[PDB]
Design a protein that fits this description.
Shape of chain A: globular
CATH architecture of chain A: Up-down Bundle
Organism (chain B): Plasmodium falciparum (isolate Dd2)
Strand content of chain A: 5-15%
Structural class of chain A: alpha+beta
CATH topology of chain A: Glutathione S-transferase Yfyf (Class Pi), Chain A, domain 2
CATH class of chain A: Mainly Alpha
Protein name (chain B): tRNA-binding domain-containing protein
Number of helices of chain A: 8
Strand order of the largest sheet of chain A: 2-1-3-4
Distance between the termini of chain A: 27 Å
Largest interface: A-B, 21 and 20 residues
Number of strands of chain A: 4
Oligomer: homodimer
Helix content of chain A: 40-55%
Order of helices and strands of chain A: EHEEEHHHHHHH
């Protein structure tokens, strides 16, 4: 139903891209419509979820995408949450070493954690990372980024 | 309704203590807490929906019993702080270094609780479960070396522990 966001929020960017992920990856149904205010919230039915995580797991519940968003197939729920929690705990700021790691990790894997499809981690780090020297030095990251950008960004979303 | 847990898991203990916190902290209404079972994986079957792991079930519980404002100190506007402490902990796989202990002890110096000045927070719960293993074998001289932590732990143990938990 009603998903209130914030105009320039990395967290709101995350939620938008999550909604897009839902649209593109799971819908084959009424998504929420977006409003803007000071603080993220989600009024659904007669319940009111507040803030990002509450809203994230709320949506995840509403739309039954937990096994997808957290890669339950491969039993890598722990890895996913550990990455997104690490990122959010570092206030969504990525050191250049994390940047070079990420490239080393995207060397073999198509995505950051799953070998199959996009994860919640991919979403978080996408929004959190969103010239030429970087594009050639950190080629795997650039590829991954372009791939996510074209495959996932859709109806809501941010800049391209 | 029905909550399934795991026999030797910090995460399971966390959910137990969360239920205890709900019981103690949140007479007019006497609502039905979930019943506890033990399998190989945490779950929570409520109505006809099934929430699958620690954080899904945690936020499920938090929604059902509407204790978010207490657990995250929304009164004091310290939600972010709470989130970042428990997230830092979860990112470190609930592992606490001795380096953490000496600074955590300093953080608990004047303060009754880890983050809140009022009542126990979700942070307090997580760190309670996470240090219980590290403290139920720590010597008295050492246990007193970080005294504020000891006081806090005892506080929590006596105030929160109830029927649901099993920490000794």
């Amino acid at each position: 139903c009603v998903l209130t966001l914030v105009k320039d929020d990395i967290k709101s960017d995350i939620l938008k891209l999550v909604l897009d992920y839902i649209k593109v990856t799971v819908v084959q149904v009424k998504l929420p419509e977006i409003c803007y205010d000071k603080k993220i919230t989600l009024q659904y039915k007669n319940k009111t979820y507040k803030d990002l995580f509450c809203t994230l797991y709320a949506l995840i519940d509403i739309y039954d995408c937990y096994s997808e968003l957290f890669n339950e197939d491969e039993g890598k729920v722990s890895e996913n949450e550990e990455f997104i929690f690490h990122l959010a705990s570092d206030k969504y700021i990525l050191k250049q070493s994390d940047m070079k790691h990420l490239n080393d990790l995207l060397c073999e894997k198509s995505y950051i954690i799953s070998n199959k499809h996009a994860s919640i981690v991919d979403i978080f780090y996408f929004c959190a990372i969103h010239a030429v020297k970087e594009r050639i030095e950190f080629s795997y990251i650039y590829r991954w980024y372009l791939h996510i950008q074209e495959t996932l960004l859709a109806n809501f979303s941010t800049l391209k």
